[PDB]
Design a protein around this nucleic acid. Structure first.
Ligand SMILES: Nc1ncnc2c1ncn2[C@@H]1O[C@H](CSCC[C@H](N)C(=O)O)[C@@H](O)[C@H]1O
Ligand SMILES: Nc1ncnc2c1ncn2[C@@H]1O[C@H](CSCC[C@H](N)C(=O)O)[C@@H](O)[C@H]1O
Ligand SMILES: [Mg+2]
Ligand SMILES: [Mg+2]
Ligand SMILES: [Mg+2]
Lengths: 291, 193, 291, 192
DNA sequence: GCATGTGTTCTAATTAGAACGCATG
DNA sequence: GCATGTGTTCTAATTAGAACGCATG
């Protein structure tokens, strides 16, 4: 589908990340070993940006709200070899009873990704490589999922984070990355059971954890919503460092900006499962420099 | 877009969505009344329309979009008509080397709110022009227009006061309206009658 | 002075830590390279014990409230080569206008250190090595400092953490450690200015900060209580990661038990300046095994 | 400690803290009636005395500690008297080898709160015994005693409880505490 | 068969902030 | 010569927590 590139012809990667959150895309790309030439992030949340700059020491160019990016900015900041983004899903996920759908509220920010993706696309006659990816929730109105795919002219592959993590997270992934439909396999350094994510003297009640949202209620599991962890014979909730390892983020990744328990889960609740993104970005190593 | 000599002005191949303007454009005289495969294509529900659908429908010289007029007929969200218009618009763009003039226009009948209007201009790369279409005794018609037709961006319409004209919008609760905005297309294509 | 010990005759160190806090004693002992045979900590604050157990993976034997440590406990848990501790100073420091001296309130807990120290002392006829150390604040009544010295039969050494950290911390140190009176020196890895403790894209207004207490008002500096940090052209308070670097603790040392900003500052505000304790415990590596 | 033959019982050497019992002790024949100071040493304020002082004050056979008698005349906190008493006690204790019998005792005239009492007993390694002086028509004397004297503890004294001792805290020696000191007679010289 | 969910919300705890304090180099 | 301090307290913003929601394999 994509023409192969010899190693010497490979140049560093130039990524436009919209709705960057806590810079999961940059983290995955650099943990893979890909040389990141430029990482332009569009993010509005201050605490999110604080995580991105501090943890990545200012390699990320922040360009705030996506709706103020013009066609000129895409050509100035460009060219981009990869355009990634997850639009907010508070008005698309079925967890919200008062969802407002794709066309109202917050869902309409999807079209901003679609708009700026066309700006970033190489013009006809530019055979150079170009990849993109878009993520959102599975629990979405079939009309909304239909329309998203309509605008992106692509159908999503669903990858559930439980194959590679200790948590339920089923998300759709639109894109043109090489081999997205390939079978998802676990790695030997993937913490597949909740017990592998816990700290010392902490016992896991379950092997896997229900889908983690922003709020504290998604930590307590099941019918009766029991605590997931026992410590010293006492029921307890997950810890921030444990939520981070569930997601595949480095430990203390969100120990930033004096953030407490709730703020760190709020950022983590919206984020991506790092091993899932690593599975998606892995074939990019054969198109860009690596050191 | 330099103008075309009269002896090489082909008839328009127009795609009009959400609203049929066959009557308006035939009256002004862009369309044959005799019908071989129709030059105007009209669709109203394009949620299942793909690029090769538009591509197979033959090259299009103009793409027209319009919100529904004021009333309970708005089955869908207001922003849906624009996003779908912008989506199909890219499907109708020809190869980079432009063999002929390609025009596009999207009209709003005072349907979209201001949050929708600034989203509109960002996607259409252009702030809208408003058509007063108001005689001294009758202020009946009023529409908003985004279009790359030069004369719809070139000429001096008569200005209006928007706070008073959003009051016209819910006081409501065609030729000079937008068909006068259709006239400048005449120089680029053929006149029939 | 105790006789020097040949390298082969040295055994691991067995230390009894009273009012252990966040296991600063174990930390500097392990970071000095000293083999810790046993570390018996008597601590009552749950979050404190959480930090000690998790950050050191259960090498610390916690033996709750110190007033419940019997004589028999000392010989069973013993013998002890080192006895360390700092009693609560909320009823001794001058920062509290309602202090109650060391004979009422929490000041009596000093005599618990005096009581258990005499238990741990090697009986006459056993001149094996034995070291002890006790820390408290300088801003105490001269009668309190007098009596403390009386019971311990020793006069204190004042060491201010400003020579080795970026913060004012003047505390008395009673003990018999080798060369406590020697001049303290800075190391290469000693972060001596606040800029060295701050994160990326953060600017320090001062070189040194005032004495860190448990409360947030001690982060504000000077007559007008200005913010100590500027970031993005906005004034901000110190971060928990930065307070840890100020005290010499490892980064994210107190990212335990879902603790927020206030809780982590409360544990750190009462702790020891790690480089000061490293200076005090440094000569011990000539009396015990090191690996 | 076993009991001593009558012909080897040397005169007792005592150190009394915060309270002078030279009058109470001479009454029961422990100090020579005249000009024998070496038996009792008395110190009222201790905050500045070092072990080298107690060591130089001659070895002691008994170390007595006492609280101020019930009355609003104490600048020191109630816990101060025990902590200082415990401080000097280990200064006065002889070498691990026992050349003679060494005793100590601490009495409270109902001035310590309960938490002062539990701290007191933990430091003195025993819960105290209470000594009531009751005659039915009198409720006069009552004190608490921590001591290693073997006979002050064992004798099953009259058992009465503390809410009546706090009826004495609504009230907020010759017969009672002389009976307390008698068992020391079997270990040192009787002067009569 | 019925447990599930990249959230909104309202309320009950819970914490963050500033005043407060004064002997002392 | 004033600024400083291993903290207590009471208030005003905070957040934590659980109820709410229901189409769907
Ligand atoms: N108008 C806007 N412009 C740019 N970013 C926005 C935005 N509105 C919301 N966002 C951000 O978009 C993010 C969507 S949640 C997705 C986070 C990201 N995919 C991750 O891996 O963490 C949120 O962090 C939100 O702060
Ligand atoms: N009765 C008691 N028994 C044991 N520990 C106690 C105690 N009362 C208070 N403490 C603890 O003693 C500690 C004194 S603050 C000193 C902490 C320690 N020096 C450090 O480096 O962090 C506090 O953490 C307090 O929780
Ligand atoms: Mg960091
Ligand atoms: Mg950890
Ligand atoms: Mg010195």
């Amino acid at each position: 589908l994509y023409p192969a590139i010899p190693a010497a012809r490979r140049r560093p990667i130039r990524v436009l990340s919209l709705f960057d959150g806590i810079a999961t895309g940059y983290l995955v790309l650099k943990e893979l070993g890909i040389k990141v030439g430029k990482y332009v992030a569009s993010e509005v949340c201050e605490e999110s940006i604080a995580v991105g700059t501090v943890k990545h020491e200012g390699n990320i160019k922040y360009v705030n709200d996506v709706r103020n990016i013009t066609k000129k900015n895409i050509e100035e900041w460009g060219p981009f070899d990869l355009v990634i983004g997850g639009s907010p899903c508070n008005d698309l996920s079925n967890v919200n009873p008062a969802r407002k759908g794709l066309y109202e509220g917050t869902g309409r920010l999807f079209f901003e990704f679609y708009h700026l993706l066309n700006y970033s696309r190489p013009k006809e006659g530019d055979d150079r490589p170009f990849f993109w990816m878009f993520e959102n929730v599975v629990a979405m109105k079939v009309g909304d999922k239909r329309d998203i795919s309509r605008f992106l002219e692509c159908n999503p592959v669903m990858i559930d984070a439980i194959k590679v993590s200790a948590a339920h997270r089923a998300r759709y992934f639109w894109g043109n990355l090489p081999g997205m439909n390939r079978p998802v396999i676990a790695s030997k350094n993937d913490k597949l059971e909740l017990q592998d994510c816990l700290e010392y003297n902490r016992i896991a009640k379950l092997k896997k954890v229900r889908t983690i949202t922003t709020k504290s209620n998604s930590i307590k599991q099941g019918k009766n919503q029991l605590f997931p962890v026992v410590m010293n014979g006492k029921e307890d909730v997950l810890w921030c460092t444990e939520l981070e390892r569930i997601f595949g983020f480095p430990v203390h990744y969100t120990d930033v900006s004096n953030m407490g328990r709730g703020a760190r889960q709020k950022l983590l609740g919206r984020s991506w499962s790092v091993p899932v993104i690593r599975h998606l970005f892995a074939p990019l190593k054969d198109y860009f420099a690596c050191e | 877009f330099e103008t075309v000599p009269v002896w090489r002005r082909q008839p328009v191949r127009v795609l009009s969505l959400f609203e049929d303007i066959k009557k308006e454009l035939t009256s002004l005289g862009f369309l044959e009344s005799g019908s071989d495969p129709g030059q105007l294509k009209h669709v109203v529900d394009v949620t299942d329309t793909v690029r090769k659908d538009v591509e197979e429908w033959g090259p299009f010289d103009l793409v027209y979009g319009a919100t529904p007029p004021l009333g309970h007929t708005c089955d869908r969200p207001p922003s849906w008509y624009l996003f779908q218009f912008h989506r199909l618009l890219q499907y109708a763009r020809p190869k980079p080397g432009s063999p002929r003039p390609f025009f596009w226009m999207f009209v709003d009948n005072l349907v979209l709110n201001k949050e929708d209007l600034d989203v509109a201009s960002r996607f259409l790369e252009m702030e809208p022009v408003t058509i007063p279409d108001v005689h001294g005794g009758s202020l009946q018609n009023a529409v908003r227009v985004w279009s790359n037709i030069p004369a719809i961006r070139s000429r001096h319409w008569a200005l209006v006061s928007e706070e008073e004209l959003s009051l016209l919008a819910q006081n409501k609760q065609p030729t000079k309206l937008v068909k006068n905005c259709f006239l400048p297309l005449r120089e680029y294509f053929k006149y029939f009658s």
